[PDB]
């Protein structure tokens, strides 16, 4: 159960606007074996989001894929 997440978000610095850039991932709802949902396991111990941080300047496309890859794996 400790491997499941309730949600994942990624962050980086937006130098044009002078704020942070945040992107939320998308839950692929993968079809797997067994009869217990990943969403039942995820809520058991800690409902806070996972945060992927980078301190530099990133493009939106990259941040979105990073959050999605993390969740899928």
């Amino acid at each position: 159960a400790r491997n499941q997440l309730p949600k994942v978000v990624s962050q980086a610095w937006n130098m044009s606007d002078q704020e942070l850039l945040e992107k939320e991932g998308v839950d692929p709802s993968l079809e797997t074996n067994g009869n217990i949902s990943s969403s039942d396991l995820a809520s058991l111990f800690d409902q806070e989001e996972e945060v992927l941080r980078h301190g530099g300047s990133k493009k939106d496309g990259s941040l979105q894929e990073w959050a999605n890859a993390k969740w899928t794996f």
Binding site: S16, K59, D60, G61
Partner: protein
């Protein structure tokens, strides 16, 4: 014989909602003014969106 004006704006662009399965509540009433300010991916030659 003509209607009264509210305003005149340069650099106007038209956009339409993409129907993806969900409940779009905002179709009951028009989306309020001032909600939108960004592209999905920043392209470097743009400054602000109103």
């Amino acid at each position: 014989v003509v209607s009264q004006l509210i305003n005149i704006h340069a650099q106007a662009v038209e956009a339409v909602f993409e129907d993806q399965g969900s409940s779009g509540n905002h179709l009951e009433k028009g989306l309020p003014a001032e909600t939108i300010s960004k592209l999905q991916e920043r392209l470097s030659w743009i400054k602000s969106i109103q």
